[PDB]
Short mmCIF file of C-alpha atoms and ligand atoms in Angstrom, two decimals:
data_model
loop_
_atom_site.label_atom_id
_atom_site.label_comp_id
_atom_site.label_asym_id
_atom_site.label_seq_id
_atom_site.Cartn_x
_atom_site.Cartn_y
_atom_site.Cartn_z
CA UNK A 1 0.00 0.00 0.00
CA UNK A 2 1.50 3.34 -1.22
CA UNK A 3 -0.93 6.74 -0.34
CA UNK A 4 -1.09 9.85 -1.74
CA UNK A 5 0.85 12.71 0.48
CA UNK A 6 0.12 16.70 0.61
CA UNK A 7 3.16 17.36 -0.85
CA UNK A 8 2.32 14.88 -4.31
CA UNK A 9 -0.66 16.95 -5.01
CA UNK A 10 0.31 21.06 -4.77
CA UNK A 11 -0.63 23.22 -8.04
CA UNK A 12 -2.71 20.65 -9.16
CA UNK A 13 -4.05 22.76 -12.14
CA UNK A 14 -0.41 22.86 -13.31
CA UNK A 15 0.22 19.38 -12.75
CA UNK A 16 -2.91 18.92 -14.88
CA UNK A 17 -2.09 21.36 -17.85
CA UNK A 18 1.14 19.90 -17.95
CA UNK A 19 0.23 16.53 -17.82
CA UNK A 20 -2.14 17.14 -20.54
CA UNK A 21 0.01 19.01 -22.71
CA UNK A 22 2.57 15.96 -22.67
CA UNK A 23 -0.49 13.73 -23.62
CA UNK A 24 -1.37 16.00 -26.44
CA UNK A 25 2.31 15.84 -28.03
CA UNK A 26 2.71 12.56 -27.49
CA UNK A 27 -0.88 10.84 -28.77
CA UNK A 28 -2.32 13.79 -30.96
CA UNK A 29 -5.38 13.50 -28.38
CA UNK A 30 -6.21 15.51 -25.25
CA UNK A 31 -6.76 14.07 -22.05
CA UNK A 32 -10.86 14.67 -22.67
CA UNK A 33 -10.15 12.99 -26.33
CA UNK A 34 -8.14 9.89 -24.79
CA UNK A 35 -11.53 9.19 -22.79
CA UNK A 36 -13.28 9.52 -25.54
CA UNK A 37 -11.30 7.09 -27.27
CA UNK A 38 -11.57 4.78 -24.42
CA UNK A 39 -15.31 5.09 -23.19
CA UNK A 40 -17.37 7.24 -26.23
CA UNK A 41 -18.01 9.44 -23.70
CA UNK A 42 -17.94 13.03 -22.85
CA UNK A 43 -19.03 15.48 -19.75
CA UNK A 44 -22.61 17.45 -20.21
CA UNK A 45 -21.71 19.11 -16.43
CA UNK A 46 -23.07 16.49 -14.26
CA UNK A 47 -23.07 16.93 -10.94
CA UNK A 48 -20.21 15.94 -8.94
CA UNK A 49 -20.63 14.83 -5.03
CA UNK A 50 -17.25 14.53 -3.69
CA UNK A 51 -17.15 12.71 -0.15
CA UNK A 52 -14.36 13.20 2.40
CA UNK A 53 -13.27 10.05 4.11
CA UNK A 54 -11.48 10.17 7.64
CA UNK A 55 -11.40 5.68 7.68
CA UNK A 56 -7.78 4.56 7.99
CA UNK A 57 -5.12 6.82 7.23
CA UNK A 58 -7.84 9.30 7.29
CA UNK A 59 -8.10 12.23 5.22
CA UNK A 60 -5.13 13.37 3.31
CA UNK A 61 -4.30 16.83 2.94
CA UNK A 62 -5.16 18.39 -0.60
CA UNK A 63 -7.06 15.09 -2.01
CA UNK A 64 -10.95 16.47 -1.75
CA UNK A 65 -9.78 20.30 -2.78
CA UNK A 66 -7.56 18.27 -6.18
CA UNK A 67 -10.59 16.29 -6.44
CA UNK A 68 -12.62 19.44 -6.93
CA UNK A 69 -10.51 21.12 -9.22
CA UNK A 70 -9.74 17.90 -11.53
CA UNK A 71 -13.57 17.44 -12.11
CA UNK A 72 -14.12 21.11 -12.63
CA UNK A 73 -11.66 20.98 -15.67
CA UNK A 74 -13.25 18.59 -17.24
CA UNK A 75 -16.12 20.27 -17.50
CA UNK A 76 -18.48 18.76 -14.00
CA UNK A 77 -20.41 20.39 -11.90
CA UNK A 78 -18.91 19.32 -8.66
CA UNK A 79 -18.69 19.89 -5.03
CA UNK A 80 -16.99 18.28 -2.08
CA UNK A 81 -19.71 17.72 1.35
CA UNK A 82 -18.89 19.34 5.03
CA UNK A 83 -19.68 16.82 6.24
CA UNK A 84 -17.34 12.53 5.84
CA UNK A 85 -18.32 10.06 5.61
CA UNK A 86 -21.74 8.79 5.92
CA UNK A 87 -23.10 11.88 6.92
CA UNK A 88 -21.42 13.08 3.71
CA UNK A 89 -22.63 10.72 1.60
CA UNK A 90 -26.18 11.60 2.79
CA UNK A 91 -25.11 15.13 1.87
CA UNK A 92 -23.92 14.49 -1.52
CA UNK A 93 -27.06 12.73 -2.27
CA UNK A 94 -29.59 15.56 -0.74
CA UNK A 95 -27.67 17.81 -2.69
CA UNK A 96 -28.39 16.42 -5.80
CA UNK A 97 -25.26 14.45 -6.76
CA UNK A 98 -25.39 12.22 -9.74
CA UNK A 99 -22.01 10.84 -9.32
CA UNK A 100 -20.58 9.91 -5.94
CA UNK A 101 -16.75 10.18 -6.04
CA UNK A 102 -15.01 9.19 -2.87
CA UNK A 103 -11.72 7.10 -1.67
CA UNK A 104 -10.56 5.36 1.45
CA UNK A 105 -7.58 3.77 1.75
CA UNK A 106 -8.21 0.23 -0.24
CA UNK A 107 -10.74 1.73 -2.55
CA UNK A 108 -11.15 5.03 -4.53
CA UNK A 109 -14.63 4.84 -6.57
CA UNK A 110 -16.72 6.64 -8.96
CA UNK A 111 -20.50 5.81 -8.57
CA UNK A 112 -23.39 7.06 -11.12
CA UNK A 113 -26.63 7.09 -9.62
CA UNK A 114 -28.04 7.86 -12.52
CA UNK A 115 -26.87 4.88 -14.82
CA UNK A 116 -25.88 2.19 -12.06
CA UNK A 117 -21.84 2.31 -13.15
CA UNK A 118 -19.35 2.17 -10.87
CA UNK A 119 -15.27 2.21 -11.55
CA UNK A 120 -12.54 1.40 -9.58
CA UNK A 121 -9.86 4.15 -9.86
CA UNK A 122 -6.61 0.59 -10.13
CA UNK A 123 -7.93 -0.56 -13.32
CA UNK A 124 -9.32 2.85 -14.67
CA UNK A 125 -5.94 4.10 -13.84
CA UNK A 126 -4.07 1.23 -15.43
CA UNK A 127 -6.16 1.14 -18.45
CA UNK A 128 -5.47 5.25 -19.30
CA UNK A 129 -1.82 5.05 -18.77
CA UNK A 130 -1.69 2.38 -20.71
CA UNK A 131 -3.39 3.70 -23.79
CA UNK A 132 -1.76 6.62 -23.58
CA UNK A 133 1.54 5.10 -23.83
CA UNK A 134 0.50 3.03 -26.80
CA UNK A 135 -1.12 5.78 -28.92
CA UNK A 136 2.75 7.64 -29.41
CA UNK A 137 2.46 9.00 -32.74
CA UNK A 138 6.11 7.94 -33.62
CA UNK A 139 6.49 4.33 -32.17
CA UNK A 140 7.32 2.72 -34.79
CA UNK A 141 6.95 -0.60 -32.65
CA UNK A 142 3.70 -2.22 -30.78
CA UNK A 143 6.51 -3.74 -28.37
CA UNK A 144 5.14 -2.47 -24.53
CA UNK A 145 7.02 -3.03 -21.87
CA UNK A 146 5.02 -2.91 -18.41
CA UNK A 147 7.09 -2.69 -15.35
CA UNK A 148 5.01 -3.47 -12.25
CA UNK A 149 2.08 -5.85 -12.28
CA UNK A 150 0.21 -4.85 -9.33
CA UNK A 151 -3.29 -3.38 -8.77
CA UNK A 152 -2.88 -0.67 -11.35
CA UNK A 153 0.03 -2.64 -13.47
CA UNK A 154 -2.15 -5.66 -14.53
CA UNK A 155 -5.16 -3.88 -15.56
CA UNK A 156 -3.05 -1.99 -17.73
CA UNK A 157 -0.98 -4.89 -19.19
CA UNK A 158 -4.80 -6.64 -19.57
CA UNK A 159 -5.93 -3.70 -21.66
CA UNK A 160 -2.50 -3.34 -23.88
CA UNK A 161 -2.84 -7.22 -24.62
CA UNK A 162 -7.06 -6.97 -25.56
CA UNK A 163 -5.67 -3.94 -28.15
CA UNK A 164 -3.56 -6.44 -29.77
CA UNK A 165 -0.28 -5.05 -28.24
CA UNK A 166 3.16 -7.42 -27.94
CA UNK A 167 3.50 -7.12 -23.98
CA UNK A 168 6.37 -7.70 -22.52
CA UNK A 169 6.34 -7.68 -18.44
CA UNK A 170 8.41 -7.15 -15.18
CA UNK A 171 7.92 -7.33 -11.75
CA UNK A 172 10.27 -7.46 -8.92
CA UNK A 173 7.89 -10.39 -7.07
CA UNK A 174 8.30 -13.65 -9.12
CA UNK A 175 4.66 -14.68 -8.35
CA UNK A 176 2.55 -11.54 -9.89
CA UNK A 177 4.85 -11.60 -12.70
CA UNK A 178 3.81 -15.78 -12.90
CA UNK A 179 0.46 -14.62 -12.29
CA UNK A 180 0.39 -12.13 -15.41
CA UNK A 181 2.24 -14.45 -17.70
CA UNK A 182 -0.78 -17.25 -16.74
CA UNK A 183 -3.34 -15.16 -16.84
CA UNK A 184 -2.81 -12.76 -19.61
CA UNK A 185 -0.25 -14.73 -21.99
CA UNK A 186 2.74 -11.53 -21.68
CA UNK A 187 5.70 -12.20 -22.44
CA UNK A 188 7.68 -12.01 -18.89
CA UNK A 189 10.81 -9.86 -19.36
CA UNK A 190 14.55 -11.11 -18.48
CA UNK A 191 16.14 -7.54 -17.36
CA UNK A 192 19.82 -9.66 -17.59
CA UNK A 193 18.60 -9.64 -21.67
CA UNK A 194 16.91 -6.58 -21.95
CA UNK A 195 16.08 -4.49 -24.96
CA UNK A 196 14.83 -1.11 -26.42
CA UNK A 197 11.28 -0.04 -26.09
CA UNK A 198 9.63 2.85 -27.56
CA UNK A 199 6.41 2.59 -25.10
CA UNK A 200 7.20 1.63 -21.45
CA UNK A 201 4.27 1.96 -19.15
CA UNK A 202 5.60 1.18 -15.31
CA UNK A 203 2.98 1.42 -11.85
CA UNK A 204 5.23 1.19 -9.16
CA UNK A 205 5.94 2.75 -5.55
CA UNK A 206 9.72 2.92 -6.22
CA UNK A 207 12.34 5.18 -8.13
CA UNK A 208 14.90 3.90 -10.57
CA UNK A 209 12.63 0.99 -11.62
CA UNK A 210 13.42 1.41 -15.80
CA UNK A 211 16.87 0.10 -16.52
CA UNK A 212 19.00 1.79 -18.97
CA UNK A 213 19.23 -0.27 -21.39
CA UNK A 214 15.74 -0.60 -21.95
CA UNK A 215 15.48 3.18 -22.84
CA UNK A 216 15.38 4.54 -26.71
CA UNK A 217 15.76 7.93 -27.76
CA UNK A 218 12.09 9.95 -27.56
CA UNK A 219 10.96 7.03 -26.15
CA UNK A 220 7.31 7.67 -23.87
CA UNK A 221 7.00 6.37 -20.64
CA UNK A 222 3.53 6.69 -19.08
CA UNK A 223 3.34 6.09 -15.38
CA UNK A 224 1.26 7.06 -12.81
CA UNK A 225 3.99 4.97 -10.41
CA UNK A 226 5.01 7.77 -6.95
CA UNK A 227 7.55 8.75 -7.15
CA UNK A 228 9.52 9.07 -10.41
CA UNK A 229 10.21 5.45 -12.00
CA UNK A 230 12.98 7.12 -14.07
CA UNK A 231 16.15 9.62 -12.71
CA UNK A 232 16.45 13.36 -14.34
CA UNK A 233 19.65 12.49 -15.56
CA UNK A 234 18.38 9.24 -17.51
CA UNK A 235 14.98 10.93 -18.69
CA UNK A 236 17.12 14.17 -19.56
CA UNK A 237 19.94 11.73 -21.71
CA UNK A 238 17.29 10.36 -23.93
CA UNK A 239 14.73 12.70 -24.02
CA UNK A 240 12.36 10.36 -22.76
CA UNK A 241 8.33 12.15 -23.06
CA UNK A 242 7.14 11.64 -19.27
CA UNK A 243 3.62 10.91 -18.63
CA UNK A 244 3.93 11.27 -14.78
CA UNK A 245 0.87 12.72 -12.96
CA UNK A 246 -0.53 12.14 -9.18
CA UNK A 247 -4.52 12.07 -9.40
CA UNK A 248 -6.01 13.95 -12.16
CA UNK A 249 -5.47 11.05 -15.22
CA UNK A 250 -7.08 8.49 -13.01
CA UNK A 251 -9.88 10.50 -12.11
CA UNK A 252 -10.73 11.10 -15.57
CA UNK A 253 -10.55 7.78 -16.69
CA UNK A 254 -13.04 6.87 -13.69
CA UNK A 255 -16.00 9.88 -14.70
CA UNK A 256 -15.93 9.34 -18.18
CA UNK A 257 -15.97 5.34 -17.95
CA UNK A 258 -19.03 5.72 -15.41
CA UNK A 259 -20.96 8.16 -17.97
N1 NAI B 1 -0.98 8.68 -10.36
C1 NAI B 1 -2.18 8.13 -10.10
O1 NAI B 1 -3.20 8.59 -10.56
C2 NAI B 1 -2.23 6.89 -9.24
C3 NAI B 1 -1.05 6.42 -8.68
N2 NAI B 1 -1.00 5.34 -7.91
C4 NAI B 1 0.33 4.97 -7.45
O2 NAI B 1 0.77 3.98 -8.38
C5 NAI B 1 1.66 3.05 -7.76
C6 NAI B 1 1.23 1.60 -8.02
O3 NAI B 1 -0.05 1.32 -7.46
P1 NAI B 1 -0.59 -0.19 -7.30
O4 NAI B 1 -0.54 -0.87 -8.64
O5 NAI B 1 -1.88 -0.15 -6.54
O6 NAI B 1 0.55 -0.82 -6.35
P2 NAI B 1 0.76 -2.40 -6.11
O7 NAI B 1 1.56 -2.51 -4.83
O8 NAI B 1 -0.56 -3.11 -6.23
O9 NAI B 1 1.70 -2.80 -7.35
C7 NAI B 1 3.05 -2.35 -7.43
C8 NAI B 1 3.88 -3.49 -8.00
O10 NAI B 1 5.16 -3.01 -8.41
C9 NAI B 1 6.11 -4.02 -8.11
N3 NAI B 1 7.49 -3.48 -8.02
C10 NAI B 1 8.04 -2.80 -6.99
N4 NAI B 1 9.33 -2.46 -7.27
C11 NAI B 1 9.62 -2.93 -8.50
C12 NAI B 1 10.79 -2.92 -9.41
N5 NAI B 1 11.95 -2.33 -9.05
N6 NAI B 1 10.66 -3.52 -10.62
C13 NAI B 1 9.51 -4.11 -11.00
N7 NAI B 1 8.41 -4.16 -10.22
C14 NAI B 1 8.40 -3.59 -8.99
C15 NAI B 1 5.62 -4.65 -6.82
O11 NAI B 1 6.12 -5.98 -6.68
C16 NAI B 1 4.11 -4.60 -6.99
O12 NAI B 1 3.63 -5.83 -7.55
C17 NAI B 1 1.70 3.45 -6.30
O13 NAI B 1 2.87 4.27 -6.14
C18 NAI B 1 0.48 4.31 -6.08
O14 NAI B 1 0.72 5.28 -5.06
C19 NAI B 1 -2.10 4.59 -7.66
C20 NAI B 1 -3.35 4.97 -8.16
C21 NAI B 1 -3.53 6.15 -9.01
N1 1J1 B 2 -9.89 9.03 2.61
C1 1J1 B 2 -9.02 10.11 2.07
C2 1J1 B 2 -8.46 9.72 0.70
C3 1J1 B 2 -7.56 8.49 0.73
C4 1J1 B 2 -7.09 8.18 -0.69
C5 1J1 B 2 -5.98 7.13 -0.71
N2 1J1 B 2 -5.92 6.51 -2.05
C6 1J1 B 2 -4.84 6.91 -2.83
O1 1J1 B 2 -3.91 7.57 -2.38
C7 1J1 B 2 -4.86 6.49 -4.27
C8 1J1 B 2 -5.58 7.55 -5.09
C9 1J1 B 2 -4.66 7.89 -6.25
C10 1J1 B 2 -3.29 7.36 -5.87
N3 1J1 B 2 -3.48 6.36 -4.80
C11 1J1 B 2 -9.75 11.42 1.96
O2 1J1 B 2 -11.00 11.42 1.81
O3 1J1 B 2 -9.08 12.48 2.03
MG1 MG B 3 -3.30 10.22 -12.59
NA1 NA B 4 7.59 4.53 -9.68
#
């Protein structure tokens, strides 16, 4: 279990534009336009209940304010409750809410009332990284790799495989890696006879997780892995295009998969 801190989420608007712009140079697409891609979907300002939870951890710092401003961009009508919780969720719903969007520490969910659909922000995260990283423009390969097969790696290696991607895939525990290469059919990558990838999508909790000698020039990596899975120095040496943001991806591929 890895958790979102204060610190990961200040400027979120910036971290937003930013990420965006990267996933407009890279793809050709918007983040709005990747959901669209994904789901057929698109926002008609639907209202947006957004529930602070104090269970576990409790409530982090920054998450229900980011929350706010994420949905605003993309064009909801949101609001976060006074009230957590329960009382909260009674809130939201008084208030009109049509989507409930809320988070403890083993879940973070997205549930219409209107339409019944619910998403799960692991796999909605997974799945968005993951097409992002294989819609680079200049490629010039359908060879993924996908470092990290975990909650939010697996999902995304799933997805890469059902678009007809080659999907080659690492992670440091031998038995999800077994697990993914069973369950999925990936190819499970050797790093002692590693080689050059144009897409690399990675979801880990650790630094320094991309080797190398995995790395091409202008290569994209799309991760939404805390903190950085690659060094300046390395992403700096081979201009690697860094999809890298803390919240605001996931959240979008959770509200437009539930409209
Ligand atoms: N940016 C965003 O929107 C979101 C980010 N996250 C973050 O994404 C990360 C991953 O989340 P989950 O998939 O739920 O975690 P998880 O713990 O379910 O999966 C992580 C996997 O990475 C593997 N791993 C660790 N070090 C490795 C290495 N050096 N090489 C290869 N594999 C390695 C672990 O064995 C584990 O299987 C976390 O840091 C979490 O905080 C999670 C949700 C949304
Ligand atoms: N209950 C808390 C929120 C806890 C969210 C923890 N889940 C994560 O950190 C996920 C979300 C994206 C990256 N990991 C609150 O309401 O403030
Ligand atoms: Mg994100
Ligand atoms: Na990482």
């Amino acid at each position: 279990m890895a958790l979102l801190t204060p610190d990961d989420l200040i400027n979120i608007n910036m971290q937003l534009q930013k990420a965006d712009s990267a996933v407009q140079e890279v793809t050709g697409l918007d983040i709005k336009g990747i959901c669209k891609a994904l789901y057929g979907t698109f926002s008609s300002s639907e209202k947006v209940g957004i529930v602070p939870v104090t269970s576990g951890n409790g409530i982090i710092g920054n998450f229900s304010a980011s929350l706010h401003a994420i949905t605003q961009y993309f064009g909801f009508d949101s609001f976060v409750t006074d009230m957590p919780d329960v009382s909260g969720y009674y809130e939201a719903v008084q208030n009109g809410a049509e989507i409930i969007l809320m988070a403890d520490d083993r879940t973070f969910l997205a549930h219409n009332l209107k339409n019944g659909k619910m998403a799960n922000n692991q796999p909605c995260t997974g799945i968005i990284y993951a097409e992002i990283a294989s819609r680079y423009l200049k490629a010039d390969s359908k060879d993924v790799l996908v470092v990290g097969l975990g909650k939010v790696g697996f999902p995304g290696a799933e997805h890469l495989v059902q678009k007809d991607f080659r999907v080659y895939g690492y992670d440091a525990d031998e038995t999800l890696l077994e697990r993914a290469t069973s369950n999925l059919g990936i190819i499970p990558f050797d790093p002692a006879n590693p080689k050059k990838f144009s897409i690399i999508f990675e979801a880990t909790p650790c630094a320094n997780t991309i080797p190398e000698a995995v790395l091409s020039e202008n290569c994209v990596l799309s991760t939404p892995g805390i903190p950085c899975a690659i060094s300046e120095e390395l992403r700096d040496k081979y201009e690697v295009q860094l999809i890298a943001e803390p919240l605001g991806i996931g959240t979008a591929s959770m509200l437009y998969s539930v409209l």
